[PDB]
Amino acid sequence: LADADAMHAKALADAKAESEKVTEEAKQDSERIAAQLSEQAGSEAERIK
Amino acid sequence: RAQASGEVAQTLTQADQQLSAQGDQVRSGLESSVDGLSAKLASRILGVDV
């Protein structure tokens, strides 16, 4: 039962760390996607001009 | 894209106005020659000076 408590705490800590890593990667990929869409917007505006 | 289309429309309308005015201007220049051009064409079809 004790080990179970330690494993639950470790699982929660690992889940928090992995959530932080996943959200960091997601923010990076979101920034890249926004940059790509903004560049595409610039290209579309140039084409219209 | 909407902003680009709007600015393209604005420049299109401005250019349309400017070109219409400038064509109205060049109309007088064209009319200045119309007579000589017509005389030359008549002479060319007749094969002799009009």
B1 to chain A, any CB pair closer than 8 A? The answer is yes
Distance of CA A3 to the CA centre of its chain: 32
Resolution rounded to one decimal, in angstroms: 2.8
Cβ neighbours for B29, distance < 8 A, ≥ 6 positions apart: none
| Closest residue on chain B to A38 (Cα) | B1
The method recorded for this entry reads cryo-EM
Instruction: Pick the residue of B1, B7, B12 with the most A CBs within 10 A to test the interface with A by mutation.
Output: B1
Distance from CA of A33 to the nearest CA of B (A): 18
Quickly list DSSP for chain A. -HHHHHHHHHHHHHHHHHHHHHHHHHHHHHHHHHHHHHHHHHHHHHHH-
B7 to chain A, any CB pair closer than 8 A? The answer is yes
